[PDB]
Symmetry: D2
């Protein structure tokens, strides 16, 4: 099996989108500009498990430009973009993903990505840690072969920390999420644009005048709240951390609990990465045609199982859009069956912010393969100078003119002018 996709006839349209995407991802293009003739990743066979989209396609191709075999699966069962999976398949790269996978077909795709023509994998590129947990639970014999792993998302690094703690994480990993460039842009500015896209494409509902409830006010919650506020929704935040909770209050958001908010929320958006956020007792109290969705990583935040078993009727409006009628006569509109809505009902984050995440990922793959010394078995961060490098590579596109310290100023501040300008603990 050379690959698996929904349609290879879409590869042509796919190639167009990539050419456009490339122009929006300077960070990744510098890497090609800089490491083409060098091929640092020479020898590496990188098994990837990220959302197979136009943005990821460009990432994959960049990894190859640096000289490395790559096999790919999708980490979510509806995130994949058919034409993007096609253009990568047509380029001679084993990709196993499509938009509409079942749970068995999802697990089946990750398996094809483990063995290459010249032996098993030696690098993981994961998000959420499905490919990490799989190789640790099903194929522990392949763990000594793997040299490094790089994790994209917040749930998958929290899981990589829980593994190192329980002494089961046998391979060294780099936390790419906690790069400032990822967490404080991707999670923040990314969802701020793609949440509403997902919701709009699915429902075409008016945001203005509505009351929107956002569970969680971390980086993702912040972006979602800001977005809905932008279109003149009234936003209500729920939260368990007093610091995050206070941040939201100081921004003019009412902060209460779901038990209260469910009685006035028109729109619901879980962003906690936690279970049991919206339950049946919430559903029973919601206004008619309340719109419920999730933008956390796993579909564990909404009790969809309750809606199935307790709804009077379930009308499907179109793919990833269900309209339940309840025994109280009012209806609930659920999106993407609880799975993340921005990739399930839209095209995910725009290419530019992904260039920031994926530029981090290239460096995270280079470091783990070019300097296997620095990184023992643990959970490490990328050095700030490299984190700043990613930011610097995107300034050009945005036409940003950056100031440079005089020698006198550098001496006053006691820092090297090229040198990272912030201490490690700096929170931006």
């Amino acid at each position: 099996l050379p690959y698996k996709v929904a349609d290879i006839g879409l590869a042509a349209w796919g190639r167009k989108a990539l050419d456009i995407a490339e122009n929006e991802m300077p960070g990744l293009m510098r890497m090609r500009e800089r490491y083409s003739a060098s091929k640092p990743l020479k020898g590496a066979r990188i098994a990837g498990c990220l959302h197979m989209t136009v943005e990821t396609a460009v990432l994959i191709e960049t990894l190859v430009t640096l000289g490395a075999e790559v096999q790919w699966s999708s980490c979510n069962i509806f995130s994949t973009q058919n034409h993007a999976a096609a253009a990568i398949a047509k380029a001679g790269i084993p990709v196993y993903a499509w938009k509409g996978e079942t749970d068995e077909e999802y697990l089946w795709c990750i398996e094809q990505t483990l063995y290459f023509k010249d032996g098993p994998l030696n690098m993981i590129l994961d998000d959420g840690g499905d490919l990490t947990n799989l190789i640790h639970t099903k194929y522990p014999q392949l763990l000594p072969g793997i040299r490094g792993i790089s994790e994209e998302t917040t749930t998958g690094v929290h899981n990589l920390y829980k593994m190192m703690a329980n002494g089961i994480l046998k391979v060294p990993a780099i936390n790419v999420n906690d790069s400032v460039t990822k967490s404080k842009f991707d999670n923040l500015y990314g969802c701020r644009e793609s949440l509403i896209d997902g919701i709009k494409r699915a429902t075409d509902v008016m945001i203005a005048g509505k009351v929107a409830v956002v569970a969680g006010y971390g980086d993702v919650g912040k972006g979602c709240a800001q977005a809905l506020r932008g279109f003149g929704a009234r936003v209500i935040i729920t939260e368990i951390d007093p610091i995050n909770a206070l941040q939201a209050a100081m921004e003019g958001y009412e902060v209460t609990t779901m038990d209260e908010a469910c009685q006035e929320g028109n729109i619901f958006v879980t962003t906690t990465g936690c279970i049991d956020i919206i339950l049946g007792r919430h559903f029973e109290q919601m206004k008619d045609d309340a719109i419920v969705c999730n933008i956390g990583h796993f579909d564990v935040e909404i009790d969809v199982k309750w809606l199935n078993e307790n709804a009077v009727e379930k009308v499907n409006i179109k793919p990833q859009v269900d309209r339940y009628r309840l025994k109280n006569g009012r209806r609930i509109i659920l999106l993407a069956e609880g799975r993340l809505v921005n990739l399930g009902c839209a095209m995910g984050h725009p290419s530019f912010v992904m260039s920031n995440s994926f530029t981090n990922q290239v460096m995270a793959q280079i470091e783990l393969w070019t300097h296997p010394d620095k990184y023992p078995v643990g959970v490490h961060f990328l050095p700030k100078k490299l984190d700043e490098a990613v930011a610097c590579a995107h300034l050009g596109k945005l036409n940003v003119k950056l100031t440079k310290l005089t020698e006198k100023q550098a001496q006053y501040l006691g820092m090297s002018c090229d040198g990272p300008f912030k201490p490690d603990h700096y929170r931006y």
Copy 2:
């Protein structure tokens, strides 16, 4: 002989019907209208030909006119703005509709003409958007004019035309400026666009707004929404304008305000909203950055010089329907959206149904006003009473769960004002 309708695919009726049901729940203005008039059937004996974007929202409007006892026949007012499943639902209901997404300039005029004659005779009411149907009748069917009781016009361009026609003594039918109803011009035009513009752009291009420079030509009600929407997603918005007052507003709101001659060198994204010709020209295109996105959301596609692109470009690649990517002799590329047609309906579903409920409630009211009170309206261009305007707004407060304050008799008397009638003078600008 004569077709019953013509649409993309009648199969999409079942799907459209679901959309209609959902939309109905978002459009209290039209539903109250139904609950209030379905028995009295005020529009009985009216034969209304409509030229308006055949969308899900318009479907709900059409079925409301029918419930009010009218006979309706519809065509879209833009070749790209029809939503096929919405047309299927209406067609399957038994309503003569002539609209599909992707019409030729030829087919578009054909579609309108299929509406002009009903089984019970010719049209006697006009529900127009942009003035296309108004102009068509006044020009190719002037003999039909005396049998038309009135016109209601939806958008700014259309009513401008009407006023011009009135000033040149060529308008022969009395008309109602529905656009300049407060519940239309200050909500539909402003808030509607504020949400639908971004959506049009996203669907078409999937581009990051944050960090982009955006150029909005025009700062009327439409431009205000667009600027607001763009800046919300982290773009630095630049504005162009000919009205010094509008210009002052934009500056006071923190927007840089300059000329297109200047902005074309800065913009990553360009949005025309002026309703005027020749806003973006070849000289502008030649200075734009690589992969600049260019789109219009004014009523007619006369604001961007597309024919220049076609003639002077060295490459033209269709990325997908209504998304073309040109390359110019300088090697930099220009993304055009919907062949210069309005991008919110061209590349997306237009305004959300809730704000359209305001637009369309005003429409229904104007149709009742013209049909049943002809004597109120002599040949001219008229506004709805402020009372009916305020009534529209009041109809949408419930769904948003707004709680309105009531004047005490003292408060009212102090203000010299009815507790229940225009809380504002005519010239009030909200």
Copy 3:
């Protein structure tokens, strides 16, 4: 006999003069007016009595009327709104002014009366704010009316009164509604308040806005600015309103909109802007949170029941000038600002001079219009032409370095429009 003036302290003249010089640099509208008319002296032979907040901005306005050849005598229109050093500068220039910060209701009426008679005879022009001077003359000096050529009225309350007077047939002098000039109502009322409200509150209390719940009564132009300003600093704004249209706007903008009966239990901060009586009552006060701040920014102090506080409170402690801290029987405390008078001028310097330049340019123009074109204006309530309105805006574009677009002859002809005359129809609401 008759004093030349009366002000707090003539010593503050030197200081005020500096402020005047700075202000002049921020008010191009008035300066262009000077450069344009100082030689022609259009207002020669005019004897203008003014009742308007004696601030730095007004000083600049006064000296502009003098440069235009007029004889001016001034009193403030609010007992708390005068800025002493601004009054000193005017007094020292030789202009009869009667104003100081901290006037009694008695002294305030006295101050106005000192303006009614000039050395060269009685007043023949009125420049009023709120209608106090208009009503005074029509009531206690009706014999003076026939020798008055016209009136210009600055604020919403004042023009409402004028229209009422016109509808009851008791207005005997022709007047110009300056408030409903676009360059006033959409800038002064909106943007002016957006900056000066917060400043009034800060100076008075130095309280954190972020994290507070704020209740704004009224969502007209003034309320819109206040809501905007408060939400900007991280307050959750709640709105009350009687006009369903205004209410819809507020909701569409993301504000919760309910009744004062409800809000009084939530608010940390309360801001009245309705221009109506009895907005906040004892029943409201009794439910407010501890140390709730309460203030008004409408024209008259009739919106808050201060006398209730005085009579029913168990404690009253003056914290500092125009800041009183009550305690109620429930043990919770209420902070009142400026005895319920408008808080932006009461506890701060009012609007910044730049936006006031728009208000005051319209004023100067109205005075020239009434003085030199009486025949244009018969007894009634009139608007300035849109042309002059647009001219005001154009005068302030330069300082902000705005670059305005010019129509091509084709573009204009397409739009059926002068390149240089009202770019909008009358009913346009901007």
Copy 4:
């Protein structure tokens, strides 16, 4: 000398302001509620060097409620609020500060605060580190007596890091600035309100329609930019860090250099904590009546010395407001003589956000005196649980209803429900 103030007759008015302030500073009131009968600080003699204002008055009194002698000076020469310094003097607490100090009178005030009735000081409470650097340079014999120090502001902790690095910091210190509760509220939300207050009171200029230039886009720059944006200024950011620079670009701010910005800026606000930000060549290019000011800690960011020597004329408008005329005929309005404008031309930050900083400061003083073991000679942070405690103590006032994890959810997330909910590196 029992104290030194501008007027003790203002103590009455001062007491009123405190009673009001107290109601806005719940965080500090809980500390009194909790440690009055306990007097943990019993034995401590705390020499303070913070801005002597209404907010600080409440802090001082809280420290005393916990049973500790306190002497106080002001760290800036125009920040002090007379009536607040009066109410503390009248309460029997040696305070040496007033609004209008000279440089010699400033140094003179810090000296009185060193020796108490029962011996020299044993605790520092500094900001900027003037009292820290003084005792290290002038009175090193008193260093062994001092048990702990707590630093408030960003410049004073960067200086405390430079001292520990050069092995000259002989006493253990707690970094209070880098508490999330301080840096991500005080610096951020505080200046967002008090910058414009300072500018308004000084000039009464219209913000709308103006172009404002903000040097720096850290926590302070972020607040200042957001504020000016709020009133419809067009804001331009200058910056040396690509990450901070990119953040500003993704928020819709034009990011260029001062060399460009000076030619269109109507208003100028330095927030870098760095020298030589605005020089004569910038001044020469500025528009007429450009308004220049600074909200960084030291008055080193603006070249006022240049304006004095090169201006044609210098008209004083009122205190802390100069209007220079230049040889090009255009004028510059300088505020507070370059010193920080929010405390020099207004009343500083509102009491509520200060309650967050000062609640941190109490815990920082308790920890250094109650548990002298945990903190050796270095630069330490407060533990996240205490940082979250500060946030929690303010939720009540704001009417925030916080969610609590179920046992099931806590187990899913693998965290204690009371337990800090974020990893150390979390950036909020």
